[PDB]
Amino acid sequence: MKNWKTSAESILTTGPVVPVIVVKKLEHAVPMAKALVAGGVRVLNVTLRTECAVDAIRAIAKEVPEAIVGAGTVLNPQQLAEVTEAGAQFAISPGLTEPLLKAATEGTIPLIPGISTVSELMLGMDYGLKEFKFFPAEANGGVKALQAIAGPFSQVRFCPTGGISPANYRDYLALKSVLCIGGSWLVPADALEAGDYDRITKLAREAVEGAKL
Amino acid sequence: MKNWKTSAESILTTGPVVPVIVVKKLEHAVPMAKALVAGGVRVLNVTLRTECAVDAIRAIAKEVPEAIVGAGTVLNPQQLAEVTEAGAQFAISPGLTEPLLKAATEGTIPLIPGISTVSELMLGMDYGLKEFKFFPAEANGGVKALQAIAGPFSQVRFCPTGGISPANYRDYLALKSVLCIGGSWLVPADALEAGDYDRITKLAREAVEGAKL
Amino acid sequence: AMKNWKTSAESILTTGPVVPVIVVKKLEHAVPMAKALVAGGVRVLNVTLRTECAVDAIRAIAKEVPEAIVGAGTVLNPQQLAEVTEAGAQFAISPGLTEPLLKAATEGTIPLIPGISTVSELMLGMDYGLKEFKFFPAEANGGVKALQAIAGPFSQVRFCPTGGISPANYRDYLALKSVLCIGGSWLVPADALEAGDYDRITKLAREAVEGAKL
């Protein structure tokens, strides 16, 4: 897209895993981001699921410029505009709607929107998108669905998210249609509480190393 | 919009179970509704799956003031207007479309529409809705799928329906995202056919009591 | 029925129990493959828009094998629908649906049997007057159980499930009241097609038709 200098494909090809981040306490955002980056995971999906999320995006953008920071759980144009102004470099949505797709394609940052079904994929493709989130992946029919959902759509590429962990992420990464996966396991809620940044860095390092096929 | 004197949330919080009613003979409708009310179940989803359904809603609306009667399997604005005219206090649909969402939100009674995917949830939220049916619940991936679908959406609430029975309804009621559940087991076709209203009352009371804890 | 369609979508699905999902890589294979399928008793040919020669294959089959009911699959938008209609497709199948595709289809001249996975998608198709749908991808959608539940509140709709259907499971679907036929790729194996092994294609079609009987 001539409106998106940073392509959706570039976001998804940066690394094999995109952490789904829920940050309950702002003060933890920056050291969490540094811990991820130290472990080799740079694309951070900061979800709009807590009050401090947008402030977390602004903080990480300023203090951790090697992190590629984006907003998740973006549901509508208002939230998309808010995170764009706050410095999000991309947006992820759990599903798609026409107002959100229209706003995204009119704006400056890539949206990688979730789909569950081929009709939803077709709607996103009608807006010119070719990279999608597959969410919730396990609930959608999993790897077998992508071998099938992605079938008639040889050119479309995905980031599956939802019920993915070290036990199964390789099953997804093995697919030609999959560029990367997402999951919350890299930033456990209690690790942030405990200031266990070492644990976060280790999970990141393990996830990247464990991804080599 | 302000348009609904009865909120969707009030329909879903009246009690833990909403019977999915399929009534083939009109003469059965009023005694069936009375039998449910006697068992403590008083939100009655009369599905538009039989010729007599709208007449059944009309009769129950007039004769059983201790029940709140509504219509289910409402597919389109034509049906919505019919059940509104007949005295339905709410409408349930198995999925959603924009013409149905527009007509409902512009109209006088709450619509609780089914969804299966997050995109469908988001389209409903674009029309201001926050209470949905999760249908067909077991075919949508059950409790786990519902937990994943509901996760990015802390505020949304559900009524799962489809494949729910005493064997599994507590699993759904245990979830923070669930207000009540729907099921056809409270009004079995053979009970209606045999005029066993006593058994309907017992099924209703068993359901209500079994929902506690 | 749809005022602009000379052929009903229902008639497409009631032609036979099995609709082959065809991926044709080289044009010269298209006509003999079509004749081989017809000779095995299978004549509704879903030529998917997954290869460069697909549209020319539809045109060739429409010309040389007019006794086949040839159509186009993997139709994703109004442009592709118009293109296949001009080529001689007698119907169109899509893996999913969108409002622009539904609108173009109902204004156009050939039946569209579009894929759905959820009841909201079914309801959108129904808003356009459609009653015949594909259920895709069937097995990953949750198979016969899913289809049973989804089809429940919808007694008049009929389906063609496609996606993971095989001789192992197709009778499971064909036994359902809501199912008229199924789609499958096993009748036209890629290697048979490239090898020009047409007797094998005929045998597989004949076996599929006989095995469909309940």
Give the pairing of strands B68-72 and C69-73: unpaired
User: ∠ CA(A135), CA(A139), CA(A141), 5° rounding?
Assistant: 95
The CA-to-CA distance between both ends of chain A, in Å, stands at 31
| A181 vs A19: CA distance, rounded Å | 9
Bond preceding residue B136 cis, omega within 30 of 0: yes
Token pair 């229209």: residue: A102
| A201 vs B7: CA distance, rounded Å | 47
Q: How many CB atoms lie within 10 A of CB B38?
A: 17
DSSP string across C44-78: EEEEES-STTHHHHHHHHHHH-TTSEEEEES--SH
Q: Find all residues with CB under 8 Å of A29, minimum gap 6, and list them.
A: A23, A46, A52, A55, A56, A59, A60
C-chain residues near A118 (CB < 8 A): 95-96, 115, 117, 136-137
User: ∠ CA(A33), CA(A35), CA(A37), 5° rounding?
Assistant: 70
Torsion sign across C-alpha atoms B73, B92, B80, B88: positive
CA proximity to B154, closest of A85, A53, A161, C141: A53
Give the pairing of strands B111-115 and A131-134: unpaired
Q: Do B93 and C123 touch (CB under 8 A)?
A: yes
DSSP A115: E
Q: Do B119 and A100 touch (CB under 8 A)?
A: no
Separation of CA C38 from chain center: 15
DSSP string across A135-151: TTTTTTTHHHHHHHHST
Torsion sign across C-alpha atoms B169, C153, B22, B109: positive
| C169 vs C172: CA distance, rounded Å | 5
CA proximity to B209, closest of B177, B166, B175: B166
| C95 vs B26: CA distance, rounded Å | 41
B-chain residues near C144 (CB < 8 A): none
Q: Which two tokens stand for residue C38?
A: 């017809």
Give the pairing of strands B111-115 and C18-22: unpaired
Q: How many CB atoms lie within 10 A of CB B159?
A: 27
A-chain residues near C93 (CB < 8 A): none
Between the CA atoms of C154, B156, B145 and A137, what dihedral angle is there, to the nearest 10 degrees? 110
Contact indicator for B97, B105 with CB cutoff of 8 Å: no
DSSP C87: H
B-chain residues near A135 (CB < 8 A): 118
Give chain C's length: 214
Sheet holding C112-116, edge to edge: C158-161, C132-135, C112-116, C92-94, C69-73, C44-48, C18-22, C182-184
| B48 vs B73: CA distance, rounded Å | 5
Q: Do A122 and C101 touch (CB under 8 A)?
A: yes
Q: How many CA atoms lie within 13 A of A158 on its CB side?
A: 33
Q: Which CATH number is associated with domain A1-213?
A: 3.20.20.70
| A137 vs A160: CA distance, rounded Å | 5
Report the residue of chain A nearest C163, measured CA to CA. Answer: A148
Q: Which two tokens stand for residue B116?
A: 């299966």
The SS3 call for residue B21 is: strand
Q: Give the number of B-C residue pairs with CB atoms closer than 8 Å.
A: 58
CA proximity to A50, closest of B127, B155, B9: B155
How determined? X-ray
Token pair 């009841």: residue: C119
- Chain C neighbours (≥3 Cβ pairs under 8 A) are A, B
| B191 vs A73: CA distance, rounded Å | 46
The residue of B21, B116, B138 whose CB has the most chain C CBs within 10 angstroms, and thus the best one to mutate to test that interface, is B116
Burial class of residue B18 in the structure, from the number of CB atoms within 10 Å of its CB (0-12 exposed, 13-18 middle, 19+ buried): buried
DSSP A97: -
Taking each helix axis as running N to C, give the angle between helix C99-107 and helix C119-127, from 0 to 180 degrees, rounded to the nearest 10.
30
Numbered residues of chain B with Cβ closer than 8 Å to any chain C Cβ: 47, 49, 73, 75-76, 93-97, 99-100, 114-117, 120, 123, 135-136, 138-139, 141, 162-163
Provide the residue ranges of all domains of chain A, joining segments of one domain with +: 1-213
| A91 vs A85: CA distance, rounded Å | 12
Residue ranges of alpha helices (H) inside C72-152 are 78-87, 99-107, 119-127, 143-151
The CA-to-CA distance between both ends of chain B, in Å, stands at 37
Query: What are the distances in angstroms from CA B143 to CA A165, A176, A185, B170, C209?
Result: 19, 30, 20, 10, 39
| A184 vs A23: CA distance, rounded Å | 11
Q: Which residues of C106-124 are buried (b: 16+ CB within 10 A; e: fewer)?
A: bebebbbbbbbbbbbbbbb
Q: Find residue B178's DSSP bridge partners.
A: B158
Sheet holding B91-93, edge to edge: B157-160, B131-134, B111-115, B91-93, B68-72, B43-47, B17-21, B181-183
| C48 vs C33: CA distance, rounded Å | 14
Numbered residues of chain C with Cβ closer than 8 Å to any chain B Cβ: 117-124, 126-127, 142, 145-146, 148-150, 152-155
The residue of A115, A118, A121, A132 whose CB has the most chain C CBs within 10 angstroms, and thus the best one to mutate to test that interface, is A118
Token pair 């998108």: residue: A129
Phi-psi region of B174 (alpha: psi -120 to 50; beta: other; left: phi over 0): alpha
C1-214: CATH topology is TIM Barrel (3.20.20)
Q: Which two tokens stand for residue C209?
A: 């038709």
